[PDB]
Amino acid sequence: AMTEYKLVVVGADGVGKSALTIQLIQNHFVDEYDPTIEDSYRKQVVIDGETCLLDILDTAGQEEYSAMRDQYMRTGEGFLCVFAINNTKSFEDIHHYREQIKRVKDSEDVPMVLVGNKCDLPSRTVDTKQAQDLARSYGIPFIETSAKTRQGVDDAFYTLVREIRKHKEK
Ligand SMILES: C#Cc1c(F)ccc2cc(O)cc(-c3ncc4c(N5CCC[C@@](C)(O)C5)nc(OC[C@@]56CCCN5CC(=C(F)F)C6)nc4c3F)c12
Ligand SMILES: Nc1nc2c(ncn2[C@@H]2O[C@H](COP(=O)(O)OP(=O)(O)O)[C@@H](O)[C@H]2O)c(=O)[nH]1
Ligand SMILES: [Mg+2]
């Protein structure tokens, strides 16, 4: 049987969560994917010769807390925490997303990757030092992505899978 990995993509509206997920699954860049659609997508990919079936939750919608949303997020094995390099507020928000993951996982050691998306854009307000300092504080990898050019997309998802394996057997 394939090995299943439950991945969850989190961050502010507009950072590129859907664009990154669609690049991974469909190998194209979507300009305008409905900002309100939250769904789980499946990708079969071989990583270090293991056939993986990724279950990727592309988050969306309102800021709502419930036992049922808590429990859904608790089943996540690994999280991509995405901000956009031209969105200071999305970066500032990362501490909150990590706090919510740590709360439902009741752990400081949750497989996570910090993803700085939209690296193709010229209007950079979050410098790489800010990103690297935050990831080092959390003890997690940082990787710059462009969903537009596809730079870093495979790297972000494969690295998260490897972080999950390092944490737990699969
Ligand atoms: C996301 C998320 C999330 C986790 F990563 C882990 C466990 C969670 C448990 C929960 O019950 C709920 C969530 C969750 N759901 C939605 C969430 C959501 N919305 C609106 C912005 C776009 C969206 C896709 O992130 C959905 N937004 C926020 O925080 C939004 C901010 C901005 C305005 C004030 N909020 C707090 C904040 C800071 F910086 F203090 C960021 N968190 C969510 C959340 F924790 C969990
Ligand atoms: N230039 C550029 N635009 C992007 C990138 N990723 C997403 N976008 C655009 O930013 C907007 C929001 O992306 P979306 O994936 O809908 O964000 P989400 O709200 O986090 O799902 C869309 O117009 C995307 O085309 C990227 O890496 N570079
Ligand atoms: Mg989206």
Swiss-Prot record:
Regulation of its activity: Alternates between an inactive form bound to GDP and an active form bound to GTP. Activated by a guanine nucleotide-exchange factor (GEF) and inactivated by a GTPase-activating protein (GAP). Interaction with SOS1 promotes exchange of bound GDP to GTP.
Keywords of this entry: Acetylation, Cardiomyopathy, Cell membrane, Cytoplasm, Deafness, Disease variant, Ectodermal dysplasia, Glycoprotein, GTP-binding, Hydrolase, Intellectual disability, Isopeptide bond, Lipoprotein, Membrane, Methylation, Nucleotide-binding, Palmitate, Prenylation, Proto-oncogene, Ubl conjugation
Modified residues (N6-acetyllysine): K105
PANTHER family per the UniProt record, alphabetical: RAS, DI-RAS, AND RHEB FAMILY MEMBERS OF SMALL GTPASE SUPERFAMILY
CDD domains documented for this protein: H_N_K_Ras_like
Cell compartments where the protein resides: Cell membrane; Endomembrane system; Cytoplasm, Cytosol
Name of the protein: GTPase KRas
Consequence recorded when altering K118N: In colorectal cancer samples; somatic mutation
Cellular component per GO, a single term: Golgi membrane
Catalytic activity reported: GTP + H2O = GDP + phosphate + H(+)
Effect after changing A60T: In GASC; also found in bladder cancer; somatic mutation
InterPro entries: P-loop_NTPase (IPR027417), Small_GTP-bd (IPR005225), Small_GTPase (IPR001806), Small_GTPase_Ras-type (IPR020849)
NCBIfam families: small_GTP
Residue numbers bearing the N-acetylmethionine modification: M2
